[PDB]
Amino acid sequence: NQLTKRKKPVTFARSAIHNWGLYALEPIAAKEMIIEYVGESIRQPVAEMREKRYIKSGI
Amino acid sequence: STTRRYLNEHVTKHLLEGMKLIAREKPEDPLRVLGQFLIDAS
Amino acid sequence: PVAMIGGSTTRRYLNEHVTKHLLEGMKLIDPLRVLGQFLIDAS
Amino acid sequence: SVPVIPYLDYDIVDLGSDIKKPDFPQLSESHRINEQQYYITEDTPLNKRNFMYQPCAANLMLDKLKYCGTDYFDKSSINLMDRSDKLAFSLDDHSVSVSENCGWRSVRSDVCMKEGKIYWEVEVKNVSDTSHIRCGISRREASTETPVGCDFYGYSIRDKGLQVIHEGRLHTVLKPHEMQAGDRIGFLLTLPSLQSQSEQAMDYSLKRIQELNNKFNKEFYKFLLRSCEPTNVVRDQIAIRYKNQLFYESTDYVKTTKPEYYDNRDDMQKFYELENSSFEVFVNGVSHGIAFEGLTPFLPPFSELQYNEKFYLHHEIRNKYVNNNRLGYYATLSSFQGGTASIITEAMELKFLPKDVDIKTLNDIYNEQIASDIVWDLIDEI
């Protein structure tokens, strides 16, 4: 939420590489932040189970 | 490994069991009883 | 002395009392029956 | 390539100086559970990157080693190396306790359990509806931050119902009786002899060399399982200074797979299990049956050390599956958001002892851990 004001208007659409990819909606210059990575925070043993549990079902 | 080759066939069985017995309880001289027990090892 | 340099433990008696001349009987070492009396020559 | 490290100002100690030889894991206030103040370890190193840390003493009597092994505590208790950073303990009950918002961690106790009949009891000091406790067994191979029962390097006991844990599964094979605020768990742990382990060690040595081995070059991996000797040790345990004080960089085993040797008779994968192991709990001193006959036989060929595959194959060089004085299953205790449980060492604090003849506590083997580790490195001095 601190680094939300500094981001770029890039959208996601159907990718030219793979299933889903991001499409930069403006001519970004050399060293500007596109997007802060956001998500969970979970350590190495609990993410060791999730590394296989999703691929046990097969995401 | 030369001393590690020769001794580990020999020193690991009896002298380690001789030092696993003196770890339990200790008299005022324990050098007599383990020295006696290694004559029993031969 | 070696009463605490070998370790800060009441089970660290060994590096001063017993195992000093047990290793120093092993600094010449061979059979096993002569090792029973290299256990003796600290007494 | 490097020389041995000399002695410093705290190393050579005066007679009246009763300072302790490795520096104490200093106590600091974490939380207040069971109306006691539990305390953390602040400046000591902890086991990371598949390694461990161990106290050393500046031994003066030897020429090659200026450092040999020693310990902090007089009797056995929780080892300080396998510890989290939000995990707390005390000098009153020696219970391990993570914080109120902390997660599933575990701490092993440093008894090195190889052969014989060894028995110890585990105090269950407190349990809530939101708190869980998994006291059980784990190896030196298995680490501390994961609650054990994640792999076959350890088996634990569930909190309610005693569903015996193996690879994340919950087997209700014993008699179910849940923990309460005044409970205790007694691990009657039958291990067979070290001669019984040593002949299973040649069984994985002789069946990984040439039975299924026809990668690009595997004779040099056959050679490490050729020279896979049942008790023999290639140890790299060197002394390092760390946070102004002396410690060890002792090698630790890396994670491996299931040993499945094809017996021709069984027409399937056959597993390596020990000679009649027994996994019994004493919930308040009643027999609950035997859970695990299948404790693994592990010492050279079942756990793989920290070994180098590319630096080392060009050439002197050590062996892949060797031993040390640290290999074995360990007295394990896990906690969940502050589930307080204690390990109990000596028979005066034992409340429910079995009539047995081979009742051996930690401190018989812990004194054997002190007396062997010196003389496992008195062969290193030559």
Coordinates of C-alpha atoms in Angstrom, one line a residue:
Chain A
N1 CA 0.0 0.0 0.0
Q2 CA 3.1 2.2 0.5
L3 CA 4.4 1.5 -3.0
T4 CA 1.0 1.6 -4.8
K5 CA 1.3 5.3 -5.9
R6 CA 4.5 4.3 -7.8
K7 CA 3.5 1.7 -10.4
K8 CA 2.7 1.5 -14.1
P9 CA -0.6 1.0 -16.0
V10 CA 0.3 -2.4 -17.4
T11 CA -2.6 -4.8 -18.0
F12 CA -2.7 -8.6 -18.3
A13 CA -4.0 -10.2 -21.5
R14 CA -3.6 -13.4 -23.4
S15 CA 0.2 -13.8 -23.7
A16 CA 2.4 -14.0 -26.8
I17 CA 4.5 -16.5 -24.8
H18 CA 2.2 -18.6 -22.6
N19 CA -1.3 -18.6 -21.1
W20 CA -1.3 -15.2 -19.5
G21 CA 1.1 -12.3 -19.5
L22 CA 1.4 -8.6 -18.8
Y23 CA 1.2 -5.9 -21.4
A24 CA 2.8 -2.5 -20.6
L25 CA 0.2 0.1 -21.5
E26 CA 2.7 3.0 -21.9
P27 CA 6.3 3.6 -23.1
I28 CA 8.2 2.8 -19.9
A29 CA 11.7 4.3 -19.7
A30 CA 14.9 2.6 -18.5
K31 CA 14.8 2.3 -14.7
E32 CA 11.2 2.7 -13.4
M33 CA 9.3 0.3 -11.2
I34 CA 6.6 -1.6 -13.1
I35 CA 4.9 -3.4 -10.2
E36 CA 5.8 -4.3 -6.6
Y37 CA 5.5 -8.0 -6.1
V38 CA 2.7 -8.7 -3.7
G39 CA 1.4 -12.0 -2.1
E40 CA 1.8 -14.2 1.0
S41 CA 4.8 -14.6 3.3
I42 CA 5.3 -18.2 4.4
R43 CA 8.6 -19.8 5.2
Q44 CA 10.6 -22.6 3.7
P45 CA 9.0 -25.8 5.5
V46 CA 5.4 -24.7 4.9
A47 CA 6.2 -23.8 1.3
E48 CA 7.9 -27.1 0.9
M49 CA 4.5 -28.8 1.3
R50 CA 2.8 -26.4 -1.0
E51 CA 5.5 -26.8 -3.6
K52 CA 4.2 -30.4 -4.1
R53 CA 0.6 -30.2 -2.9
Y54 CA -0.5 -28.0 -5.8
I55 CA 1.3 -30.3 -8.2
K56 CA -0.1 -33.3 -6.4
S57 CA -3.4 -32.1 -7.8
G58 CA -1.4 -30.7 -10.7
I59 CA -1.7 -26.9 -11.2
Chain B
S1 CA 44.1 -42.9 5.8
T2 CA 46.7 -45.3 7.2
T3 CA 46.2 -45.1 11.0
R4 CA 42.5 -44.6 10.1
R5 CA 42.7 -47.8 8.0
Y6 CA 44.4 -50.1 10.5
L7 CA 43.0 -48.9 13.9
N8 CA 39.3 -48.7 12.9
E9 CA 39.2 -52.4 12.2
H10 CA 40.5 -53.0 15.8
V11 CA 40.1 -49.9 18.1
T12 CA 36.4 -49.4 17.4
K13 CA 35.1 -52.6 19.0
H14 CA 36.8 -53.1 22.4
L15 CA 38.4 -49.8 23.4
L16 CA 35.2 -47.8 22.6
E17 CA 33.2 -50.3 24.6
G18 CA 35.9 -50.0 27.3
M19 CA 35.3 -46.2 27.3
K20 CA 31.5 -46.6 27.1
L21 CA 31.7 -48.5 30.5
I22 CA 33.9 -45.9 32.4
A23 CA 31.5 -43.1 31.4
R24 CA 28.7 -44.5 33.7
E25 CA 30.4 -44.3 37.1
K26 CA 33.9 -43.3 38.2
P27 CA 36.0 -44.4 41.2
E28 CA 39.1 -42.5 42.5
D29 CA 41.3 -44.6 40.1
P30 CA 39.4 -45.9 37.1
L31 CA 42.7 -46.5 35.3
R32 CA 43.1 -49.9 37.1
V33 CA 39.7 -51.3 36.2
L34 CA 39.7 -50.5 32.4
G35 CA 43.3 -51.6 32.3
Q36 CA 42.2 -54.9 33.9
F37 CA 39.2 -55.2 31.5
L38 CA 41.4 -54.9 28.4
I39 CA 43.4 -57.9 29.6
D40 CA 39.9 -59.6 29.6
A41 CA 39.5 -58.3 26.0
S42 CA 42.4 -60.4 24.8
Chain C
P1 CA 44.5 -25.9 34.6
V2 CA 42.7 -28.4 32.4
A3 CA 39.8 -28.8 34.7
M4 CA 37.9 -26.1 32.8
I5 CA 40.0 -25.7 29.6
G6 CA 38.8 -29.2 28.6
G7 CA 35.2 -28.0 29.2
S8 CA 32.9 -26.2 31.7
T9 CA 31.1 -29.4 32.8
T10 CA 31.3 -31.6 35.9
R11 CA 31.5 -34.5 33.5
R12 CA 34.6 -32.9 32.0
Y13 CA 36.9 -34.6 34.6
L14 CA 38.4 -36.6 31.7
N15 CA 40.8 -34.1 30.0
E16 CA 42.7 -33.6 33.3
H17 CA 42.4 -36.8 35.3
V18 CA 42.1 -39.9 33.2
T19 CA 42.5 -39.3 29.4
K20 CA 45.8 -37.3 29.6
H21 CA 48.0 -40.3 29.9
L22 CA 45.5 -42.5 28.1
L23 CA 46.3 -40.5 25.0
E24 CA 50.0 -40.3 26.1
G25 CA 50.0 -44.1 26.3
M26 CA 48.6 -43.9 22.7
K27 CA 51.4 -41.5 21.5
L28 CA 53.7 -44.6 21.3
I29 CA 51.0 -46.8 19.7
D30 CA 50.3 -53.0 17.9
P31 CA 48.6 -55.5 20.2
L32 CA 45.9 -54.9 22.8
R33 CA 47.4 -56.5 25.9
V34 CA 50.2 -54.0 26.1
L35 CA 47.6 -51.2 25.9
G36 CA 46.1 -52.5 29.2
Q37 CA 49.4 -51.5 31.0
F38 CA 49.6 -48.1 29.2
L39 CA 46.4 -47.6 31.2
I40 CA 48.5 -48.3 34.3
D41 CA 51.6 -46.0 34.0
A42 CA 49.7 -42.8 35.2
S43 CA 49.3 -44.5 38.6
Chain D
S1 CA 44.8 -25.1 2.8
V2 CA 44.1 -23.2 6.0
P3 CA 46.0 -23.5 9.2
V4 CA 44.6 -24.3 12.6
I5 CA 43.3 -21.4 14.7
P6 CA 45.3 -20.4 17.9
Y7 CA 44.0 -19.6 21.4
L8 CA 42.5 -16.3 22.5
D9 CA 42.0 -14.4 25.7
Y10 CA 39.0 -16.4 26.9
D11 CA 40.6 -19.7 25.8
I12 CA 43.4 -20.2 28.3
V13 CA 41.5 -19.9 31.6
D14 CA 42.9 -19.1 35.1
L15 CA 42.2 -21.4 38.1
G16 CA 39.9 -19.0 39.9
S17 CA 38.3 -17.9 36.7
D18 CA 35.1 -20.0 36.7
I19 CA 34.0 -18.6 33.4
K20 CA 32.4 -21.1 31.1
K21 CA 34.3 -22.3 28.1
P22 CA 31.7 -21.8 25.3
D23 CA 29.6 -18.7 25.8
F24 CA 26.2 -19.2 27.3
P25 CA 23.0 -19.0 25.2
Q26 CA 21.8 -15.9 27.0
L27 CA 18.3 -15.6 28.4
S28 CA 15.8 -13.0 27.3
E29 CA 12.1 -12.6 28.0
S30 CA 9.8 -14.1 25.3
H31 CA 6.4 -14.9 26.7
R32 CA 4.6 -15.9 29.9
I33 CA 3.0 -19.3 29.6
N34 CA 2.1 -21.7 32.5
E35 CA 2.7 -18.5 34.7
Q36 CA 6.4 -18.9 34.1
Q37 CA 8.8 -16.7 32.1
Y38 CA 10.3 -18.5 29.1
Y39 CA 13.5 -17.4 27.6
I40 CA 15.2 -17.4 24.2
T41 CA 18.7 -17.9 22.9
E42 CA 20.0 -14.7 21.4
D43 CA 23.6 -14.7 19.9
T44 CA 24.3 -18.4 19.2
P45 CA 24.4 -19.8 15.7
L46 CA 21.6 -22.0 14.5
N47 CA 21.4 -25.0 12.1
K48 CA 20.9 -23.7 8.5
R49 CA 21.8 -24.6 4.9
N50 CA 22.0 -28.3 5.8
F51 CA 24.6 -27.7 8.4
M52 CA 24.8 -27.5 12.2
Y53 CA 26.7 -25.7 15.0
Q54 CA 28.5 -27.2 18.0
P55 CA 30.4 -25.8 21.1
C56 CA 34.1 -26.5 21.1
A57 CA 36.8 -26.1 23.9
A58 CA 40.3 -24.9 23.3
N59 CA 42.0 -28.2 24.1
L60 CA 45.8 -27.6 24.7
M61 CA 47.0 -31.2 25.0
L62 CA 47.0 -32.2 21.3
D63 CA 49.2 -31.0 18.4
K64 CA 47.0 -31.4 15.3
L65 CA 43.7 -30.5 17.0
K66 CA 43.8 -27.3 19.1
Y67 CA 40.0 -27.9 19.6
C68 CA 38.1 -31.0 20.6
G69 CA 34.5 -31.6 21.6
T70 CA 32.7 -30.5 24.8
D71 CA 29.2 -29.5 25.9
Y72 CA 27.4 -26.8 27.9
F73 CA 24.9 -28.6 30.2
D74 CA 25.8 -31.2 32.8
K75 CA 23.0 -33.6 32.1
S76 CA 21.1 -34.0 28.9
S77 CA 18.4 -31.5 27.7
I78 CA 17.3 -29.8 24.5
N79 CA 20.2 -29.0 22.3
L80 CA 20.5 -25.3 21.5
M81 CA 21.6 -25.7 17.9
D82 CA 18.3 -27.1 16.6
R83 CA 16.2 -24.2 17.7
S84 CA 14.1 -21.5 16.0
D85 CA 14.4 -17.8 16.6
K86 CA 10.9 -17.4 18.1
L87 CA 11.2 -20.5 20.3
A88 CA 11.6 -20.2 24.0
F89 CA 12.8 -22.4 26.9
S90 CA 13.4 -22.1 30.7
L91 CA 15.6 -23.3 33.5
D92 CA 12.6 -24.4 35.5
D93 CA 10.9 -27.1 33.4
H94 CA 13.1 -27.1 30.2
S95 CA 10.0 -27.0 28.1
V96 CA 10.2 -25.7 24.5
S97 CA 7.6 -23.1 23.6
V98 CA 7.1 -21.1 20.5
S99 CA 5.3 -17.7 20.7
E100 CA 1.5 -17.1 20.7
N101 CA 1.5 -16.2 17.0
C102 CA 4.4 -18.5 16.0
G103 CA 4.0 -21.6 14.0
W104 CA 4.8 -25.3 13.9
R105 CA 8.4 -25.8 15.1
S106 CA 10.4 -28.6 16.8
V107 CA 13.5 -29.2 19.0
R108 CA 15.6 -32.4 19.2
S109 CA 17.4 -33.5 22.4
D110 CA 21.0 -34.5 21.8
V111 CA 21.0 -38.2 22.9
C112 CA 22.6 -40.2 20.1
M113 CA 20.4 -43.3 19.8
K114 CA 22.1 -46.2 17.9
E115 CA 21.7 -49.5 19.6
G116 CA 20.5 -51.0 22.9
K117 CA 17.3 -50.5 24.8
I118 CA 17.0 -46.8 25.6
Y119 CA 14.0 -45.3 27.4
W120 CA 13.0 -41.7 28.5
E121 CA 9.8 -40.0 29.3
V122 CA 8.4 -36.7 27.9
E123 CA 6.4 -34.4 30.2
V124 CA 3.2 -32.9 28.7
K125 CA 3.0 -29.8 30.8
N126 CA 0.0 -28.0 29.1
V127 CA -2.4 -28.3 26.2
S128 CA -5.3 -26.1 25.1
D129 CA -8.0 -26.4 22.4
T130 CA -5.9 -24.2 20.1
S131 CA -2.5 -25.7 21.1
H132 CA -1.0 -28.9 19.7
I133 CA 2.1 -30.9 20.7
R134 CA 3.9 -33.5 18.7
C135 CA 6.5 -35.3 20.8
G136 CA 8.3 -38.1 19.0
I137 CA 11.4 -39.3 17.2
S138 CA 13.6 -37.7 14.5
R139 CA 17.1 -38.1 13.1
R140 CA 20.1 -35.8 12.8
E141 CA 19.1 -35.8 9.1
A142 CA 15.7 -34.2 9.9
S143 CA 15.8 -30.6 10.8
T144 CA 14.2 -28.5 13.6
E145 CA 11.9 -26.0 11.9
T146 CA 9.6 -28.6 10.3
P147 CA 7.4 -30.5 12.7
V148 CA 8.6 -34.1 12.5
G149 CA 6.5 -36.7 10.8
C150 CA 7.2 -35.0 7.5
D151 CA 9.5 -37.8 6.2
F152 CA 10.9 -41.2 7.1
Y153 CA 13.7 -39.5 9.1
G154 CA 11.3 -39.3 12.0
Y155 CA 8.0 -40.4 13.5
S156 CA 6.0 -38.4 16.1
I157 CA 2.8 -38.7 18.1
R158 CA -0.3 -36.7 17.5
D159 CA -1.7 -34.4 20.2
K160 CA -5.2 -35.8 20.6
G161 CA -5.8 -39.5 19.9
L162 CA -2.1 -40.4 19.5
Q163 CA -2.3 -40.9 15.7
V164 CA 1.2 -42.0 15.0
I165 CA 2.8 -39.8 12.4
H166 CA 4.8 -40.9 9.3
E167 CA 5.4 -38.8 6.2
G168 CA 2.4 -36.5 7.1
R169 CA 0.0 -39.5 7.6
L170 CA -1.9 -40.1 10.8
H171 CA -2.1 -43.8 11.7
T172 CA -4.3 -44.8 14.7
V173 CA -2.6 -48.1 15.4
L174 CA -2.0 -47.7 19.1
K175 CA -4.6 -47.1 21.9
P176 CA -6.0 -43.6 21.5
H177 CA -5.8 -41.5 24.7
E178 CA -5.6 -37.7 24.4
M179 CA -3.1 -35.5 26.3
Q180 CA -4.3 -33.3 29.1
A181 CA -2.7 -30.7 31.5
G182 CA -1.1 -33.4 33.7
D183 CA 0.0 -36.0 31.1
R184 CA 3.4 -37.6 30.2
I185 CA 4.7 -39.7 27.3
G186 CA 7.2 -42.5 27.7
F187 CA 9.0 -43.7 24.6
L188 CA 10.0 -47.4 25.1
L189 CA 12.4 -47.4 22.2
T190 CA 13.7 -50.9 21.3
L191 CA 16.6 -50.6 18.9
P192 CA 18.6 -53.8 17.9
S193 CA 22.3 -54.1 18.2
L194 CA 25.0 -52.2 16.3
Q195 CA 26.1 -55.5 14.7
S196 CA 22.5 -55.9 13.5
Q197 CA 22.7 -52.4 11.9
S198 CA 26.1 -53.1 10.4
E199 CA 24.9 -56.1 8.3
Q200 CA 22.1 -54.0 6.9
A201 CA 24.8 -51.4 6.0
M202 CA 26.5 -53.9 3.8
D203 CA 23.1 -54.8 2.3
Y204 CA 22.7 -51.3 0.8
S205 CA 26.4 -51.3 0.0
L206 CA 26.3 -54.5 -2.0
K207 CA 23.0 -53.8 -3.8
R208 CA 23.8 -50.3 -5.1
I209 CA 27.2 -51.1 -6.6
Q210 CA 26.5 -53.5 -9.4
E211 CA 23.0 -55.2 -9.2
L212 CA 21.1 -52.4 -11.0
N213 CA 24.0 -50.2 -12.3
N214 CA 24.5 -51.6 -15.8
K215 CA 24.2 -40.8 -16.0
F216 CA 27.4 -41.3 -17.9
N217 CA 30.0 -42.5 -15.3
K218 CA 28.7 -44.4 -12.3
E219 CA 31.8 -46.5 -11.3
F220 CA 33.1 -43.6 -9.2
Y221 CA 29.7 -43.6 -7.4
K222 CA 30.0 -47.4 -7.2
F223 CA 33.4 -46.9 -5.5
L224 CA 31.9 -44.9 -2.7
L225 CA 29.3 -47.6 -2.2
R226 CA 32.1 -50.2 -2.6
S227 CA 34.1 -48.5 0.2
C228 CA 31.0 -48.1 2.4
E229 CA 32.3 -49.4 5.7
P230 CA 29.8 -50.1 8.5
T231 CA 31.2 -47.9 11.3
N232 CA 34.2 -46.0 9.7
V233 CA 34.2 -42.2 9.8
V234 CA 35.3 -39.5 7.4
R235 CA 34.5 -36.4 9.5
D236 CA 35.1 -32.8 8.6
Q237 CA 34.4 -31.1 11.9
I238 CA 36.5 -28.0 12.2
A239 CA 36.4 -25.1 14.7
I240 CA 35.3 -21.6 13.7
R241 CA 35.0 -18.3 15.6
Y242 CA 31.5 -16.8 15.4
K243 CA 30.0 -13.7 17.1
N244 CA 33.3 -13.3 18.9
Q245 CA 33.2 -16.9 20.3
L246 CA 34.2 -20.4 19.3
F247 CA 31.9 -23.0 17.6
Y248 CA 31.9 -25.8 15.0
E249 CA 31.1 -26.1 11.3
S250 CA 30.0 -29.8 11.5
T251 CA 28.7 -31.5 8.4
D252 CA 25.1 -32.5 8.1
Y253 CA 23.3 -35.0 5.9
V254 CA 21.2 -34.1 2.8
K255 CA 17.7 -35.4 2.0
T256 CA 17.4 -38.6 0.1
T257 CA 14.7 -41.1 -1.1
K258 CA 13.2 -44.4 0.0
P259 CA 15.6 -47.4 0.0
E260 CA 13.7 -50.1 -2.0
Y261 CA 15.9 -53.1 -2.7
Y262 CA 14.4 -55.7 -5.0
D263 CA 14.2 -59.0 -3.2
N264 CA 13.6 -61.6 -5.9
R265 CA 11.2 -63.5 -3.6
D266 CA 8.7 -60.7 -2.8
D267 CA 8.3 -59.7 -6.5
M268 CA 8.0 -56.1 -5.5
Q269 CA 9.9 -53.3 -3.8
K270 CA 11.2 -54.5 -0.4
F271 CA 12.0 -52.0 2.3
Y272 CA 14.9 -51.9 4.8
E273 CA 13.5 -52.2 8.3
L274 CA 15.4 -52.9 11.5
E275 CA 15.5 -56.1 13.6
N276 CA 12.2 -55.9 15.6
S277 CA 12.0 -52.2 16.6
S278 CA 9.3 -51.2 19.0
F279 CA 7.5 -47.8 19.3
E280 CA 5.5 -47.7 22.6
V281 CA 4.1 -44.7 24.5
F282 CA 3.5 -44.4 28.2
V283 CA 0.5 -42.2 28.7
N284 CA 0.6 -42.4 32.5
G285 CA 2.3 -45.7 32.5
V286 CA 0.0 -48.2 30.7
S287 CA 1.1 -50.3 27.7
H288 CA -0.3 -49.0 24.5
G289 CA 1.0 -51.6 22.0
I290 CA 3.7 -51.3 19.4
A291 CA 3.4 -48.8 16.6
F292 CA 6.6 -49.0 14.5
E293 CA 8.4 -52.2 13.8
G294 CA 9.9 -50.3 10.8
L295 CA 12.5 -47.9 12.2
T296 CA 15.1 -47.6 9.5
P297 CA 18.7 -49.1 9.7
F298 CA 20.7 -46.1 8.8
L299 CA 24.3 -45.5 9.6
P300 CA 26.7 -45.5 6.5
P301 CA 24.6 -46.0 3.4
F302 CA 21.1 -44.5 4.1
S303 CA 21.9 -40.9 4.8
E304 CA 24.1 -38.9 2.4
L305 CA 26.5 -36.3 3.8
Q306 CA 27.3 -32.9 2.5
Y307 CA 29.4 -34.1 -0.4
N308 CA 30.6 -32.3 -3.6
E309 CA 29.8 -33.8 -7.0
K310 CA 31.7 -31.4 -9.3
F311 CA 34.6 -30.0 -7.3
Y312 CA 35.6 -33.5 -6.0
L313 CA 35.1 -36.0 -8.8
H314 CA 38.2 -34.8 -10.8
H315 CA 40.7 -36.2 -8.2
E316 CA 42.7 -37.6 -0.8
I317 CA 38.9 -37.2 -1.6
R318 CA 36.3 -38.3 1.0
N319 CA 33.5 -40.9 0.6
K320 CA 29.8 -40.2 0.1
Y321 CA 28.1 -42.5 2.8
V322 CA 30.2 -42.5 6.0
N323 CA 29.5 -42.2 9.7
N324 CA 30.4 -39.9 12.7
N325 CA 29.6 -39.7 16.4
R326 CA 26.4 -37.7 15.6
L327 CA 24.3 -40.1 13.6
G328 CA 21.1 -41.6 15.1
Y329 CA 17.6 -40.9 16.0
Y330 CA 17.1 -38.1 18.5
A331 CA 14.6 -37.4 21.3
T332 CA 12.3 -35.0 19.5
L333 CA 9.7 -32.5 20.8
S334 CA 7.5 -30.2 18.7
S335 CA 5.2 -27.3 19.6
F336 CA 2.4 -25.3 18.0
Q337 CA 1.6 -21.7 19.0
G338 CA 2.8 -22.3 22.5
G339 CA 2.0 -26.0 23.3
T340 CA 4.3 -26.5 26.3
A341 CA 5.9 -29.9 26.8
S342 CA 9.1 -30.9 28.6
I343 CA 11.6 -33.7 28.2
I344 CA 12.4 -35.7 31.4
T345 CA 15.8 -37.2 31.8
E346 CA 16.6 -39.0 35.1
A347 CA 14.8 -41.8 37.0
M348 CA 14.2 -39.6 40.0
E349 CA 11.9 -37.4 37.9
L350 CA 10.5 -40.5 36.1
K351 CA 7.1 -41.1 37.6
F352 CA 6.0 -44.2 35.6
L353 CA 8.9 -46.5 35.0
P354 CA 8.5 -50.0 33.4
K355 CA 9.9 -53.0 35.2
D356 CA 12.5 -53.8 32.5
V357 CA 16.2 -54.9 33.0
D358 CA 17.6 -52.7 30.2
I359 CA 16.1 -49.3 31.2
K360 CA 18.7 -46.8 30.0
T361 CA 18.2 -43.1 30.3
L362 CA 19.8 -40.4 28.2
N363 CA 22.6 -39.7 30.7
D364 CA 24.1 -43.2 30.3
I365 CA 24.4 -42.6 26.5
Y366 CA 25.0 -38.8 27.1
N367 CA 28.1 -39.7 29.2
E368 CA 29.0 -42.2 26.4
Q369 CA 28.5 -39.2 24.0
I370 CA 31.1 -37.2 26.0
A371 CA 33.5 -40.2 26.3
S372 CA 33.4 -41.4 22.7
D373 CA 33.5 -38.0 21.0
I374 CA 36.9 -37.2 22.5
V375 CA 38.3 -40.6 21.5
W376 CA 36.7 -40.6 18.1
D377 CA 38.9 -37.5 17.7
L378 CA 41.9 -39.1 19.5
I379 CA 42.2 -41.2 16.4
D380 CA 42.1 -37.9 14.4
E381 CA 45.2 -36.7 16.3
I382 CA 47.5 -39.0 14.3

